[PDB]
């Protein structure tokens, strides 16, 4: 759309919040990371939305970066869908966390939080595990909706890119 | 500054990030909440940045809402500073969580995670507690930097408001 100033600034903000949610989602939480973290999507996807904020500065070089940011939004929206399912239906992609993050949490996992000893179902230990799992499910679904936000705004730009050219 | 389109959109995005970080920070995590959550700052502060996005639509009624959003940014930046200190130097403001959130986490606290039984310092239970405390410290400091972002942009508007009028 014509609103290239407004839309470019929205993209920079979506990029910065992906970076923030990514670094937040990299806070040590155990043996396994989300795929989003392991692919580094919030870093490389994040800076791509900052870069397509290049349409704040008013060539098909912009079409290249818009298309890359559209691919980033699509893949981020798929990756965060996958991690929500990975947490809540089965741990089907066991993406081992980066070992400098595992150094702080080497003995915990959040992809299962049922205790093997049933007396511990009441325990505070179990309630802590479900708290982290719920926070990760929250951060991933916040990241999903802002990844979906990017997809809408970039598609509404690349649509005008090709119909202009 | 003149960039009222760009700056208003930035404020709406800051508002949506606060609402998202707020709801995320309200995910059940035990007996005590951050002051930010108890004051509901990310909700009422969040919508105030959406409302001062009224300068997207180009009267001193806007000066009223800008000034309220500036007060919201200042108080949010103070409140998130307080909660970081509340977590990491002493639990000096014991803001009891809303009881419908405590219903899911009635037996855990993240403002202390040293176990009373020293054998448990190695335990996974202890590592879960420090994980949640680190996530809260992360979410609060992400919320602080975006609250500080608002303060800069609103001050750079209210400055022009009074020097225009």
């Amino acid at each position, epitope marked *: 759309m014509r609103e290239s100033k407004t839309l470019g600034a929205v993209q920079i903000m979506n990029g910065l919040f992906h970076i923030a949610l990514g670094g937040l989602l990299m806070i040590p939480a155990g*043996i396994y990371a989300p795929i989003c973290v392991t692919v580094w999507y919030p870093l490389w996807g994040g800076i791509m939305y900052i870069i397509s904020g290049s349409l704040l500065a008013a060539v098909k070089g912009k079409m290249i970066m818009n298309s890359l940011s559209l691919f980033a939004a699509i893949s981020g929206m798929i990756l965060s869908i996958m991690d929500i399912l990975n947490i809540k239906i089965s741990h089907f992609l066991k993406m081992e966390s980066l070992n400098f993050i595992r150094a702080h949490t080497p*003995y915990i996992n959040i992809y*299962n939080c049922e205790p093997a000893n*049933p007396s511990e179902k009441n325990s505070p230990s179990t309630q802590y595990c479900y708290s982290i799992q719920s926070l990760f499910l929250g951060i991933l679904s916040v990241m999903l909706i802002f990844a979906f936000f990017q997809e809408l705004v970039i598609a509404g730009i690349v649509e005008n890119e090709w119909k202009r050219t | 500054m003149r960039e009222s389109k760009t700056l208003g959109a930035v404020q709406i995005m800051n508002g949506l990030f606060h609402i998202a970080l707020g709801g995320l920070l309200m995910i059940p995590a035990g007996i005590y909440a951050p002051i930010c959550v108890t004051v509901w700052y990310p909700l009422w502060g969040g919508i105030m940045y959406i409302i001062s996005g009224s300068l997207l639509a180009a009267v001193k009624g806007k000066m009223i809402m800008n000034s309220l959003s500036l007060f919201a940014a200042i108080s949010g930046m103070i409140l998130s500073i307080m909660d970081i200190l509340n977590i990491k130097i002493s639990h000096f403001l014991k803001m009891e969580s809303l009881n419908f959130i405590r219903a899911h986490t009635p037996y855990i606290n993240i403002y202390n995670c040293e176990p009373a039984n020293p*054998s448990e310092k190695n*335990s*996974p239970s202890t590592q879960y507690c420090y994980s949640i405390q680190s996530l809260f410290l992360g979410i609060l400091s992400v919320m602080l930097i975006f609250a500080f972002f608002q303060e800069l942009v609103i001050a750079g508007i209210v400055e022009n408001e009074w020097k225009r009028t």
Partner: antibody
Framework: QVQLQQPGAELVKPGASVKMSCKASGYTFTSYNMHWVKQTPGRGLEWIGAIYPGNGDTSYNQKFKGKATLTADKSSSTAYMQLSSLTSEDSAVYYC??????????????WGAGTTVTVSA | QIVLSQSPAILSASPGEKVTMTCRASSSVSYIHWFQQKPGSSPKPWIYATSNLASGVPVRFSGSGSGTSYSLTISRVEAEDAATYYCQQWTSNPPTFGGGTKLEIKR
């Protein structure tokens, strides 16, 4: 003193079911988790699941969650495991074992003698 | 769900020989437990929480390790030490045993 007694052998038809038992003695039966462990020469020791006889909570190994069904009687102080739909691959020694928490971790500190189940026509 | 890998699968040790067997976890675990089984009997607890000998285990045995790498070592094997030794972990649900190491008397 502390002892878990099991029937030493069970012979059961394929497709049938068996309800082996584990008589606890010498300790407060309701104060400890009772665990069941399978052993087969081709797979080693597989943990099946546990019951807390105090309330009645169970947890199960996912690869057993419909094969076994744990139970406990507070009064006779006996744990039970029922295996459904028995096949050749259910022929094993089955141990009950009592887990304490001790030295800063869980610990299978006492074991039954084991029940040898043979599933045969 | 953590896989415990034991090496060697058979350890042949001459009486009085110092020997070591190792347990390697597919992920780091807070502690390893060791059980001794002789044929026709249930697994006796042998070492708990990495290094504590169970009641009546000869101080001839010791255990050590951390993270993903653990071991049990015998300062001198007796003829009575011939058995299969299983490592076990509690750090993840379900708890899992190793494949065992059969200790054999070398002659």
């Amino acid at each position: 003193q502390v002892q878990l007694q099991q029937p030493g052998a069970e012979l059961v038809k394929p497709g049938a079911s068996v309800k082996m038992s584990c008589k606890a003695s010498g300790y407060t039966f309701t104060s400890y988790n009772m665990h069941w462990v399978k052993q087969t020469p081709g797979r080693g020791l597989e943990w099946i699941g546990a019951i807390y006889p105090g309330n009645g909570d169970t947890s199960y190994n996912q690869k057993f969650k419909g094969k076994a069904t744990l139970t406990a009687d507070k009064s006779s102080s006996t744990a039970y495991m029922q295996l459904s739909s028995l096949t050749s691959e259910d022929s094993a020694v089955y141990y009950c074992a009592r887990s304490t928490y001790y030295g800063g971790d869980w610990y299978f500190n006492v074991w039954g003698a084991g029940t040898t189940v043979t599933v045969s026509a | 769900q953590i896989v415990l890998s034991q090496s060697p699968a058979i350890l042949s040790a001459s009486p009085g020989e110092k020997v070591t067997m190792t347990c390697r976890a597919s992920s780091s675990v807070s502690y390893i437990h060791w059980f001794q089984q002789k044929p026709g009997s249930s697994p006796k607890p042998w070492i708990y929480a990495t290094s504590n000998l169970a009641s009546g285990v000869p101080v001839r045995f010791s255990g050590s390790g951390s993270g993903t790498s653990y071991s049990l070592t015998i300062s001198r094997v007796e003829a009575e030490d011939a058995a299969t030794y299983y490592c076990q972990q509690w750090t993840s649900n379900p708890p899992t045993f190793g494949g065992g190491t059969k200790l054999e008397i070398k002659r």
